[PDB]
Structure formats: C-alpha cells, structure tokens
C-alpha cells in the first residue's frame, strides 16, 4: 500500500524550452528529455505553465518508482549537459 | 533553476514499521531502510503519522536527484523483499 502522492519539479519557461527542444509547456516534444517515460495510463508526465513558472509532474496513476527515478535521472543529465543548475 | 518541490510517499503504520525495523513513525532507525541518505541540510528523510497513515518526505533542502532516486530504489527493494504492495 506504498504510494507516491507527489512528484513535482519546478522550472522556468526558458529552461523548460531548452530541455523540451524549444517546445512550449503544454505538450511534450518526442525528441526532448521528458519523452520516453513508460505509460501505465495515458501520458506519464504532464507540464503546466503559470506566471513564467513551469511545473512538471508525473501523472496520477503513473507514479511508480521507475518513472520517478527516470525523471530525476533525465533532469540531472539535461541540467549537466545544458549547464543548468539542479538546485536541491 | 530546476528544483523539486514535493517528493512524498504514503504508507500504513504497519508497513512503515516493517520498513523502519519496527520503530514508530517519528524516528528513523539507523539500521532501517530509510537511513543512509545524503544529509545536505540536516535529516534527509522526515516521517509523520496521522490517522493510521504514515507520510515519508524528503526534507526541504535535501531534495536532490540522488536522494529521490535512492529513496525510490530503497522503497522498491524493501517492498519487494517484504512482499509489500507498491500500488502506485
């Protein structure tokens, strides 16, 4: 009965566009770093924009350990490759 | 900057005690499954109990990719070893 209730990451629009291959918040570019997550029910990763801030979360029924680990790994790799700071 | 604003897991008190070597919620056993994470600004893991449900989170300034990935990996390994259903 172990569940993950929140896996949320916060970014700015510029950095998200850098890591989404220049595509804006609402959709996920297939060539970007947010594509390839395993889909248990629909889109595993969703992104929203508000006041210049982009929120990237794992979907409600896709929050298994593998998706969380892959998202964290891809965020770290993209930040290091693109000289972005992954603050704790 | 890329930051994590929520890394929250939910389980039952019995399951948490199984994972925490039988210790209650407001204590992380050094020999348990939730000890040994990287301490950046204090205790990397904080657990609370309410209405028979245990919430385990990463502290505010300890939410790097390594802590999240290791917590997910340890939760998966402990759930598989102790036959606890990771329903998420």
């Amino acid at each position: 009965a172990i569940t993950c209730t929140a896996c949320t990451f916060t970014m700015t629009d510029a950095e998200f566009a850098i890591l989404n291959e220049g595509v804006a918040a609402p959709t996920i570019d297939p060539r970007g770093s947010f594509a390839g997550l395993q889909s248990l029910s629909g889109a595993p990763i969703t992104a929203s924009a508000s006041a210049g801030t982009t929120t990237v979360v794992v979907a409600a029924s896709n929050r298994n350990d593998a998706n969380i680990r892959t998202l964290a790994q891809r965020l770290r790799r993209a930040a290091q490759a693109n000289r972005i700071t992954f603050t704790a | 900057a890329i930051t994590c604003t929520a890394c929250t897991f939910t389980m039952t008190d019995a399951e948490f005690a199984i994972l925490n070597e039988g210790v209650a919620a407001p204590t992380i056993d050094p020999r348990g499954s939730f000890a040994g994470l990287q301490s950046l600004s204090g205790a990397p893991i904080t657990a609370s109990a309410s209405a028979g449900t245990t919430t385990v989170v990463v502290a505010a300034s300890n939410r790097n990719d390594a802590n999240i990935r290791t917590l997910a990996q340890r939760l998966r390994r402990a759930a598989q070893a102790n036959r606890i259903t990771f329903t998420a």
Partner: protein, 51 residues
C-alpha cells in the same frame, strides 16, 4: 571572469556536483579596501576531493 569558487557573471569553475556557497569577495564592518579583500587558503588532505 570571476576567480574559481566565486559566482559572478561568466563563472566557469563553480562546483556542479555539490551544493556550494560563493566564496566571500569582501569583508564587512570597518575593514578598509586592502584589509577588506578576501583570500581563501586550503588546508587539505589528498582525499579531500576526487577527479
């Protein structure tokens, strides 16, 4: 460009795998310019860092 360990504009030697705080650039209080400069000396063992 800023000296290593200092976070300014065009910084190139800031830590990337560790949480860091920029090295102090000037002392505060009544310290005058020459005495207000900061130099960071490192007493370290060979295992203090890994490349």
């Amino acid at each position: 460009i800023p000296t290593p360990g200092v976070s300014g504009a065009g910084a190139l030697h800031l830590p990337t795998q560790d949480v860091f705080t920029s090295l102090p650039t000037a002392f505060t209080g009544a310290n005058t310019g020459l005495a207000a400069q900061v130099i960071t000396t490192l007493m370290c063992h060979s295992d203090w860092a890994v490349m």
